[PDB]
């Protein structure tokens, strides 16, 4: 009873830079908060399709492959997954997540973007832990268990505790594609798009990888140097360096706005703000925080005073572009930033940007 076209209004546009494969370009952020979550506010569990999509950044190689299944690894909620599904209406998928109590081994947010799970043919359900792993030989060895079509193009947003892990992914992927019946055959003009953080410089990808091109997401946290890569059969070239990324990073926080969704999804607006407060209801106006005040006359009251002295300072604060310029302005205006990142944890700072984003866009 949903038209997944409709839904893909409720997802930003997206600003990225490509490197198909001279002095530094720096700016000192004085941010302390993960403002790249500004613009999504419309999503609850996961929202990396916020970030990353197939149709912008690897829209011609989806063309000219045309892929029937599409093989996703590491996502949580499979946020992506669920914006590649409203972009490709009629794809079908391959979830594999890492069977944890840590993070989601189910996709809950394409459960809530798409009506149903009708379109992911293998969820990775009955798995155990190594068999979802990609690091291990077995999730490759059954990654062909309902799907008889060949990896074609491979989406990885796993974060891997070091190089080493990723390098076993990558390694694995290949040592699959080349001995796979079902893969061998369809031949070597096969795909792997994964995240990876460039930390070093001059580091040489596995025997027979390629990289075709590095992406730099403006989604991606500013601190890190996070990117994603697409990687392919053939003679072997280099990772990207930390510095081409950082760049590159650079030059999209200096110069590019955040752009907003189309459309508001009200009710993941008002499940974000429940999420952040139990009780906060939309319009989050000043007769609004006066009431949250109000209800609170401890740890938990501690937290709650932080959560709409910060709510007041974006309300009282004037409107301006969505950019880190406007956002340090925001930050270095507020005379308990230090208290605020001190009492709230990282999944609460996630939810205060989500919801402040939505205030922002909302102004005027
Ligand atoms: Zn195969």
Same mark, same amino acid.
């Given at each position: 009873?949903?038209?997944?076209?409709?839904?893909?209004?409720?997802?930003?546009?997206?600003?990225?830079?490509?490197?198909? @494969?001279?002095?530094?370009?720096?700016? +000192?952020?004085?941010?302390?908060?993960? &403002?790249?979550?500004?613009?999504?506010? +419309?999503?609850?569990?996961? =929202?990396?399709?916020?970030?990353?999509?197939?149709?912008?950044?690897?829209?011609?190689?989806?063309? *000219?492959?045309?892929?029937?299944?599409?093989?996703?690894?590491?996502?949580?909620?499979?946020? &992506?997954?669920?914006?590649?599904?409203?972009?490709?209406?009629?794809?079908? %998928?391959?979830?594999?997540?890492?069977?944890?109590?840590?993070?989601?081994?189910?996709?809950?947010?394409?459960?809530?973007?798409?009506?149903?799970?009708?379109?992911?043919?293998?969820?990775?359900?009955?798995?155990?832990?190594?068999?979802?792993?990609? !690091?291990?030989?077995?999730? &490759?060895?059954?990654?062909?268990?309902?799907?008889?079509?060949?990896?074609?193009?491979?989406?990885?947003?796993?974060?891997?505790?070091?190089?080493?892990?990723?390098?076993?992914?990558?390694?694995?992927?290949?040592?699959?594609?080349?001995?796979?019946?079902?893969? !061998?055959?369809?031949?070597?003009?096969?795909?792997? %798009?994964?995240?990876?953080?460039?930390?070093?410089?001059?580091?040489?990808?596995? %025997?027979?990888?390629?990289?075709?091109?590095?992406?730099?997401?403006?989604?991606?946290?500013?601190?890190?140097?996070?990117?994603?890569?697409?990687?392919?059969?053939?003679?072997?070239?280099?990772?990207?360096?930390?510095?081409?990324?950082? +760049?590159?990073?650079?030059?999209?926080?200096?110069?590019?706005? %955040?752009?907003?969704?189309?459309?508001?999804? @009200?009710?993941?607006?008002?499940?974000?703000?429940?999420?952040?407060?139990?009780?906060?209801?939309?319009?989050? @106006?000043?007769?609004?925080?006066?009431?949250?005040?109000?209800?609170?006359?401890?740890?938990?009251?501690?937290?709650? @005073?932080?959560?709409? *002295? &910060?709510?007041?300072?974006? /309300?009282? =604060?004037?409107?301006?572009?969505?950019?880190?310029?406007?956002?340090?302005?925001?930050?270095?205006?507020?005379?308990?930033?230090?208290?605020?990142?001190?009492? /709230?944890?990282?999944?609460?700072?996630?939810?205060?940007?989500?919801?402040?984003?939505?205030?922002?866009?909302?102004?005027?």
């Amino acid at each position: 009873v949903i038209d997944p076209t409709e839904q893909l209004a409720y997802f930003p546009k997206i600003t990225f830079e490509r490197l198909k @494969n001279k002095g530094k370009l720096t700016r +000192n952020y004085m941010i302390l908060l993960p &403002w790249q979550h500004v613009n999504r506010y +419309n999503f609850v569990f996961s =929202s990396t399709g916020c970030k990353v999509s197939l149709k912008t950044c690897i829209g011609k190689l989806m063309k *000219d492959l045309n892929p029937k299944v599409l093989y996703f690894i590491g996502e949580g909620a499979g946020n &992506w997954m669920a914006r590649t599904a409203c972009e490709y209406p009629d794809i079908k %998928f391959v979830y594999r997540s890492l069977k944890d109590d840590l993070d989601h081994h189910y996709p809950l947010e394409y459960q809530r973007v798409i009506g149903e799970l009708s379109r992911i043919i293998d969820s990775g359900e009955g798995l155990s832990m190594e068999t979802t792993d990609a !690091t291990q030989k077995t999730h &490759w060895d059954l990654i062909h268990r309902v799907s008889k079509d060949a990896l074609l193009i491979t989406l990885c947003d796993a974060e891997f505790k070091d190089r080493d892990d990723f390098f076993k992914m990558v390694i694995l992927w290949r040592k699959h594609v080349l001995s796979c019946r079902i893969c !061998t055959t369809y031949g070597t003009d096969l795909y792997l %798009f994964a995240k990876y953080h460039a930390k070093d410089c001059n580091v040489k990808l596995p %025997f027979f990888v390629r990289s075709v091109a590095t992406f730099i997401m403006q989604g991606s946290k500013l601190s890190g140097s996070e990117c994603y890569i697409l990687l392919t059969l053939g003679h072997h070239n280099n990772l990207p360096c930390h510095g081409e990324i950082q +760049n590159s990073k650079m030059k999209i926080a200096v110069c590019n706005d %955040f752009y907003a969704a189309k459309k508001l999804d @009200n009710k993941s607006i008002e499940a974000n703000c429940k999420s952040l407060l139990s009780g906060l209801r939309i319009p989050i @106006n000043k007769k609004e925080l006066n009431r949250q005040r109000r209800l609170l006359t401890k740890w938990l009251t501690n937290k709650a @005073n932080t959560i709409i *002295d &910060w709510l007041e300072h974006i /309300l009282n =604060s004037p409107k301006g572009e969505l950019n880190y310029d406007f956002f340090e302005a925001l930050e270095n205006t507020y005379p308990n930033m230090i208290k605020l990142i001190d009492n /709230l944890g990282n999944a609460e700072i996630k939810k205060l940007i989500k919801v402040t984003g939505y205030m922002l866009v909302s102004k005027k």
